[PDB]
Amino acid sequence: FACKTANGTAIPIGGGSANVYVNLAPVVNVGQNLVVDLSTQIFCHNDAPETITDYVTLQRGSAYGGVLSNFSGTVKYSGSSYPFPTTSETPRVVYNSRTDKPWPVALYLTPVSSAGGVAIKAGSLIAVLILRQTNNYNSDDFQFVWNIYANNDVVVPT
Amino acid sequence: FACKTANGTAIPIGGGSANVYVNLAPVVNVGQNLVVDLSTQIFCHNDAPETITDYVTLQRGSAYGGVLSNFSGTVKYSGSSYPFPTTSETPRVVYNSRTDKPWPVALYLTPVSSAGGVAIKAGSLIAVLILRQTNNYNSDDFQFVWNIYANNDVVVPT
Ligand SMILES: CCCCCCCO[C@H]1O[C@H](CO)[C@@H](O)[C@H](O)[C@@H]1O
Ligand SMILES: CCCCCCCO[C@H]1O[C@H](CO)[C@@H](O)[C@H](O)[C@@H]1O
């Protein structure tokens, strides 16, 4: 089991970490949704599909920088929404094909009234999502740490 | 500086802890706000206003039980909104009168789509707000710990 990103890098069998730079809407008002869709940027595949099945959860999702202080929100995972930053590990998604399937994660962030100005700075870490992978075959328990960075400035018009 | 509640328990000079039971809207839809307004339930006053002016912030806000798991939200403090659970201490509100003035705190909670049924249980701890009071006179820095419980069940229609 391993994952890669859209045009970026990969994290191999065993787990590890990778950076993900995401394009964010450059202007968002108070009460509107910032949507960070990672199902268009993170993809994994099962490496022994005929004998092993891989179970994949979002173990922990964390907010940083401007997203931590100026936003409140949720994370949608395989069609279900949970509070973001996360307070518990999500239910598992099954990966059983050598073809790359998306990691079904999306953050839904809305700015707070006290936000004003550069709510998120470009190039800055905005979230870190952790993909935990297990299986039906052995003791293996692996974390793929995704560090999410902003490609652009986000502004909240005051 | 001291505080009381509406049918009132009190936290005396020096700080301490108290319980607050709050009436909640029994039904809240996804996309709607559950509003917990403590400005109608928590009141404070200055004990030597002719010489001392007291500074009061919301130091920390923590979410519990069903609020922790099925809601995302913000906390409003003196006309500005911040993420709830909190990530930082708020700006200070000034107390300079022996008259009881409300603590200007309100929670604004919205249920997550994966929620359904009794999202908050009656009698359960749903938040803990910490009032920090200081002043311009001496070293005093006192904490008033507010434990917020639901008076009734809150249901999210699935
Ligand atoms: C049947 C012989 C072993 C065959 C799978 C070898 C590779 O194991 C890696 O790939 C596996 C299959 O995707 C994962 O389930 C496992 O946790 C790890 O990521
Ligand atoms: C003629 C000067 C009288 C001075 C009385 C000071 C009394 O201190 C109490 O009341 C002060 C004013 O509310 C508080 O700042 C302090 O923390 C404590 O609650």
Residue numbers in the entry:
A (entry chain B), B (entry chain A): 1 to 158
Give the authors' words.
To establish a detailed interaction profile of the tyrosine-gate residues and to rationalize the binding affinities of various FimH antagonists, we generated single-residue FimH mutants in which one of the two tyrosine-gate residues was mutated to alanine (Y48A and Y137A). In the Y48A FimH crystal structure, a large increase in the dynamics of the alkyl chain of heptyl α-d-O-mannopyranoside attempts to compensate for the absence of the aromatic ring; however, the highly energetic and stringent mannose-binding pocket of wild-type FimH is largely maintained. The affinity for AM is only slightly reduced in the mutants compared with the WT, although a decrease in the enthalpic contribution in Y48A is indicative of a loss of interactions. To summarize, the Y137A mutant samples a wider range of dihedral angles with lower energy than WT FimH, whereas at position 48 the sampling range of dihedral angles is restricted upon mutation to alanine. The energy level of the Y48A mutant is less impacted compared with the WT, congruent with the low impact of this mutation on the affinity of FimH towards BF and HM. In the Y48A mutant, the backbone dihedral angle distributions of residues 47 and 48, but not of Pro49, undergo a change. The Y48A mutation has some, but a smaller, effect on the different studied parameters and the ensemble adjusts more easily to these changes, in accordance with the enthalpy–entropy compensation seen in ITC measurements.
